[PDB]
mmCIF file of all heavy atoms in Angstrom:
data_model
loop_
_atom_site.group_PDB
_atom_site.id
_atom_site.type_symbol
_atom_site.label_atom_id
_atom_site.label_comp_id
_atom_site.label_asym_id
_atom_site.label_seq_id
_atom_site.Cartn_x
_atom_site.Cartn_y
_atom_site.Cartn_z
ATOM 1 N N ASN A 311 81.743 15.221 56.644
ATOM 2 C CA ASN A 311 81.460 14.924 55.350
ATOM 3 C C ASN A 311 80.097 15.348 54.721
ATOM 4 O O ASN A 311 79.872 15.244 53.458
ATOM 5 C CB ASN A 311 81.812 13.437 54.898
ATOM 6 C CG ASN A 311 83.270 13.125 55.071
ATOM 7 O OD1 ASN A 311 83.954 13.287 54.163
ATOM 8 N ND2 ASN A 311 83.665 12.667 56.188
ATOM 9 N N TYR A 312 79.080 15.510 55.623
ATOM 10 C CA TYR A 312 77.795 15.808 55.333
ATOM 11 C C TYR A 312 77.506 17.299 54.898
ATOM 12 O O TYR A 312 78.089 18.110 55.532
ATOM 13 C CB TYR A 312 76.860 15.383 56.274
ATOM 14 C CG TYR A 312 75.413 14.999 55.836
ATOM 15 C CD1 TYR A 312 75.094 13.864 55.256
ATOM 16 C CD2 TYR A 312 74.313 15.798 56.057
ATOM 17 C CE1 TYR A 312 73.814 13.581 54.808
ATOM 18 C CE2 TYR A 312 73.029 15.722 55.533
ATOM 19 C CZ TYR A 312 72.811 14.442 54.986
ATOM 20 O OH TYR A 312 71.614 14.151 54.566
ATOM 21 N N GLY A 313 76.766 17.627 53.923
ATOM 22 C CA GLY A 313 76.375 18.928 53.426
ATOM 23 C C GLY A 313 77.429 19.727 52.611
ATOM 24 O O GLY A 313 77.241 20.869 52.315
ATOM 25 N N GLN A 314 78.342 18.921 52.021
ATOM 26 C CA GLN A 314 79.412 19.516 51.187
ATOM 27 C C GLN A 314 79.307 18.978 49.791
ATOM 28 O O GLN A 314 79.064 17.942 49.459
ATOM 29 C CB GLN A 314 80.713 19.338 51.907
ATOM 30 C CG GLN A 314 80.906 20.230 52.981
ATOM 31 C CD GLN A 314 81.753 19.476 54.105
ATOM 32 O OE1 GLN A 314 81.200 18.875 54.880
ATOM 33 N NE2 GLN A 314 83.027 19.777 54.199
ATOM 34 N N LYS A 315 79.645 19.969 48.788
ATOM 35 C CA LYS A 315 79.566 19.641 47.388
ATOM 36 C C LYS A 315 80.723 18.727 46.813
ATOM 37 O O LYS A 315 80.553 18.091 45.807
ATOM 38 C CB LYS A 315 79.749 21.043 46.607
ATOM 39 C CG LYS A 315 81.155 21.807 46.814
ATOM 40 C CD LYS A 315 81.379 22.782 45.670
ATOM 41 C CE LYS A 315 82.717 23.413 45.818
ATOM 42 N NZ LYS A 315 83.865 22.545 45.738
ATOM 43 N N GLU A 316 81.695 18.453 47.644
ATOM 44 C CA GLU A 316 82.964 17.563 47.491
ATOM 45 C C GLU A 316 82.505 16.185 47.288
ATOM 46 O O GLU A 316 81.867 15.587 48.087
ATOM 47 C CB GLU A 316 83.952 17.672 48.528
ATOM 48 C CG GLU A 316 84.837 19.011 48.522
ATOM 49 C CD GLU A 316 84.386 20.126 49.332
ATOM 50 O OE1 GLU A 316 83.941 19.962 50.339
ATOM 51 O OE2 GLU A 316 84.599 21.262 48.959
ATOM 52 N N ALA A 317 82.722 15.627 46.025
ATOM 53 C CA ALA A 317 82.328 14.300 45.635
ATOM 54 C C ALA A 317 83.042 13.224 46.403
ATOM 55 O O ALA A 317 82.396 12.208 46.771
ATOM 56 C CB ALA A 317 82.759 14.132 44.121
ATOM 57 N N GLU A 318 84.164 13.526 47.021
ATOM 58 C CA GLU A 318 84.928 12.741 47.897
ATOM 59 C C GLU A 318 84.221 12.522 49.162
ATOM 60 O O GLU A 318 84.191 11.400 49.854
ATOM 61 C CB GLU A 318 86.334 13.362 48.096
ATOM 62 C CG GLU A 318 87.357 12.417 48.745
ATOM 63 C CD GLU A 318 88.817 13.027 49.010
ATOM 64 O OE1 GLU A 318 89.175 13.944 48.101
ATOM 65 O OE2 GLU A 318 89.342 12.533 49.890
ATOM 66 N N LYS A 319 83.598 13.608 49.697
ATOM 67 C CA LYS A 319 83.047 13.685 51.001
ATOM 68 C C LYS A 319 81.561 13.019 50.954
ATOM 69 O O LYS A 319 81.095 12.470 51.732
ATOM 70 C CB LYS A 319 82.881 15.096 51.421
ATOM 71 C CG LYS A 319 84.226 15.773 51.740
ATOM 72 C CD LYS A 319 84.100 17.083 52.499
ATOM 73 C CE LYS A 319 85.409 17.718 52.717
ATOM 74 N NZ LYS A 319 85.689 18.285 54.132
ATOM 75 N N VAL A 320 80.853 13.141 49.656
ATOM 76 C CA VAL A 320 79.558 12.562 49.456
ATOM 77 C C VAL A 320 79.716 11.174 49.436
ATOM 78 O O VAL A 320 78.825 10.389 50.078
ATOM 79 C CB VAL A 320 78.848 13.131 48.070
ATOM 80 C CG1 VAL A 320 77.496 12.297 47.705
ATOM 81 C CG2 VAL A 320 78.537 14.743 48.215
ATOM 82 N N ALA A 321 80.860 10.495 48.737
ATOM 83 C CA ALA A 321 81.180 9.182 48.782
ATOM 84 C C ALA A 321 81.457 8.561 50.073
ATOM 85 O O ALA A 321 81.043 7.401 50.343
ATOM 86 C CB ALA A 321 82.341 9.086 47.918
ATOM 87 N N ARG A 322 82.185 9.325 51.015
ATOM 88 C CA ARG A 322 82.291 8.880 52.429
ATOM 89 C C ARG A 322 81.116 8.646 53.145
ATOM 90 O O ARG A 322 80.979 7.728 53.956
ATOM 91 C CB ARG A 322 83.327 9.905 53.222
ATOM 92 C CG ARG A 322 83.811 9.467 54.418
ATOM 93 C CD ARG A 322 84.899 8.406 54.180
ATOM 94 N NE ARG A 322 84.971 7.484 55.333
ATOM 95 C CZ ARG A 322 84.204 6.480 55.884
ATOM 96 N NH1 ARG A 322 83.206 6.261 55.150
ATOM 97 N NH2 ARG A 322 84.496 5.965 56.943
ATOM 98 N N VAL A 323 80.104 9.402 52.930
ATOM 99 C CA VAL A 323 78.694 9.362 53.647
ATOM 100 C C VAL A 323 77.989 8.017 53.080
ATOM 101 O O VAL A 323 77.440 7.237 53.973
ATOM 102 C CB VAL A 323 77.775 10.442 53.460
ATOM 103 C CG1 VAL A 323 76.505 10.392 54.105
ATOM 104 C CG2 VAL A 323 78.511 11.777 53.930
ATOM 105 N N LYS A 324 77.888 7.819 51.789
ATOM 106 C CA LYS A 324 77.350 6.720 51.058
ATOM 107 C C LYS A 324 78.078 5.341 51.655
ATOM 108 O O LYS A 324 77.396 4.398 51.881
ATOM 109 C CB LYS A 324 77.565 6.721 49.512
ATOM 110 C CG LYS A 324 76.758 5.577 48.796
ATOM 111 C CD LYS A 324 76.963 5.592 47.335
ATOM 112 C CE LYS A 324 76.083 4.607 46.745
ATOM 113 N NZ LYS A 324 76.217 4.458 45.226
ATOM 114 N N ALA A 325 79.383 5.453 51.820
ATOM 115 C CA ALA A 325 80.158 4.224 52.472
ATOM 116 C C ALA A 325 79.676 3.971 53.859
ATOM 117 O O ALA A 325 79.514 2.727 54.192
ATOM 118 C CB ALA A 325 81.596 4.557 52.504
ATOM 119 N N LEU A 326 79.576 5.083 54.697
ATOM 120 C CA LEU A 326 79.002 4.854 56.035
ATOM 121 C C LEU A 326 77.641 4.243 56.174
ATOM 122 O O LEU A 326 77.336 3.541 57.049
ATOM 123 C CB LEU A 326 79.153 6.149 56.866
ATOM 124 C CG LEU A 326 78.823 6.220 58.276
ATOM 125 C CD1 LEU A 326 79.459 5.061 59.176
ATOM 126 C CD2 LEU A 326 78.721 7.647 58.946
ATOM 127 N N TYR A 327 76.756 4.714 55.216
ATOM 128 C CA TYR A 327 75.308 4.226 55.118
ATOM 129 C C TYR A 327 75.369 2.727 54.869
ATOM 130 O O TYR A 327 74.554 1.959 55.396
ATOM 131 C CB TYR A 327 74.508 4.963 54.042
ATOM 132 C CG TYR A 327 74.189 6.336 54.438
ATOM 133 C CD1 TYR A 327 74.487 6.973 55.781
ATOM 134 C CD2 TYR A 327 73.380 7.059 53.530
ATOM 135 C CE1 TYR A 327 74.134 8.288 55.874
ATOM 136 C CE2 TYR A 327 73.151 8.449 53.811
ATOM 137 C CZ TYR A 327 73.393 8.985 55.084
ATOM 138 O OH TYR A 327 72.993 10.284 55.296
ATOM 139 N N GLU A 328 76.258 2.214 53.899
ATOM 140 C CA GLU A 328 76.340 0.874 53.528
ATOM 141 C C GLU A 328 77.063 0.090 54.725
ATOM 142 O O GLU A 328 76.768 -1.163 54.726
ATOM 143 C CB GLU A 328 77.208 0.732 52.222
ATOM 144 C CG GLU A 328 76.605 1.352 50.969
ATOM 145 C CD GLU A 328 77.351 1.449 49.659
ATOM 146 O OE1 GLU A 328 78.524 1.893 49.822
ATOM 147 O OE2 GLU A 328 76.800 1.296 48.646
ATOM 148 N N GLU A 329 77.913 0.671 55.474
ATOM 149 C CA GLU A 329 78.566 -0.038 56.621
ATOM 150 C C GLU A 329 77.554 -0.291 57.800
ATOM 151 O O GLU A 329 77.534 -1.487 58.358
ATOM 152 C CB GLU A 329 79.758 0.914 57.172
ATOM 153 C CG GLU A 329 80.522 0.159 58.216
ATOM 154 C CD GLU A 329 81.429 1.096 59.279
ATOM 155 O OE1 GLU A 329 81.375 2.254 58.941
ATOM 156 O OE2 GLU A 329 81.910 0.497 60.145
ATOM 157 N N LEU A 330 76.492 0.607 57.846
ATOM 158 C CA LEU A 330 75.367 0.431 58.867
ATOM 159 C C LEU A 330 74.228 -0.277 58.223
ATOM 160 O O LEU A 330 73.203 -0.253 58.936
ATOM 161 C CB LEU A 330 74.972 1.768 59.433
ATOM 162 C CG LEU A 330 76.116 2.571 60.248
ATOM 163 C CD1 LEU A 330 75.654 4.098 60.443
ATOM 164 C CD2 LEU A 330 76.459 1.878 61.555
ATOM 165 N N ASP A 331 74.365 -0.988 57.140
ATOM 166 C CA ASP A 331 73.409 -1.711 56.454
ATOM 167 C C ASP A 331 71.933 -1.036 56.272
ATOM 168 O O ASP A 331 70.987 -1.718 56.481
ATOM 169 C CB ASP A 331 73.215 -3.157 57.083
ATOM 170 C CG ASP A 331 73.837 -4.272 56.197
ATOM 171 O OD1 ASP A 331 75.206 -4.225 56.171
ATOM 172 O OD2 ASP A 331 73.125 -5.175 55.845
ATOM 173 N N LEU A 332 71.979 0.214 55.895
ATOM 174 C CA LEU A 332 70.977 0.970 55.656
ATOM 175 C C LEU A 332 70.015 0.565 54.478
ATOM 176 O O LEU A 332 68.839 0.562 54.627
ATOM 177 C CB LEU A 332 71.143 2.527 55.570
ATOM 178 C CG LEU A 332 71.833 3.277 56.902
ATOM 179 C CD1 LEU A 332 71.800 4.661 56.740
ATOM 180 C CD2 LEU A 332 71.152 2.964 58.209
ATOM 181 N N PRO A 333 70.558 0.123 53.429
ATOM 182 C CA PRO A 333 69.679 -0.497 52.248
ATOM 183 C C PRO A 333 68.906 -1.648 52.712
ATOM 184 O O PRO A 333 67.675 -1.896 52.225
ATOM 185 C CB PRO A 333 70.710 -0.866 51.152
ATOM 186 C CG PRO A 333 71.921 -0.225 51.502
ATOM 187 C CD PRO A 333 71.978 -0.083 53.069
ATOM 188 N N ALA A 334 69.415 -2.414 53.725
ATOM 189 C CA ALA A 334 68.650 -3.550 54.333
ATOM 190 C C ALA A 334 67.648 -3.175 55.392
ATOM 191 O O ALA A 334 66.540 -3.602 55.313
ATOM 192 C CB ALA A 334 69.734 -4.448 54.997
#
């Protein structure tokens, strides 16, 4: 999902970052 213009794929990466509590 990384490095692609697809909004669906960009969203999947943001979800994984949130699952691994990266904002924390």
Side-chain angles (χ1 to χ4, degrees):
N311 288 278
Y312 206 78
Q314 285 144 274
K315 65 160 182 68
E316 284 93 35
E318 196 180 325
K319 300 194 186 222
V320 172
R322 192 64 203 86
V323 179
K324 192 189 189 184
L326 180 56
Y327 286 4
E328 289 171 323
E329 187 200 349
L330 295 170
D331 253 67
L332 295 192

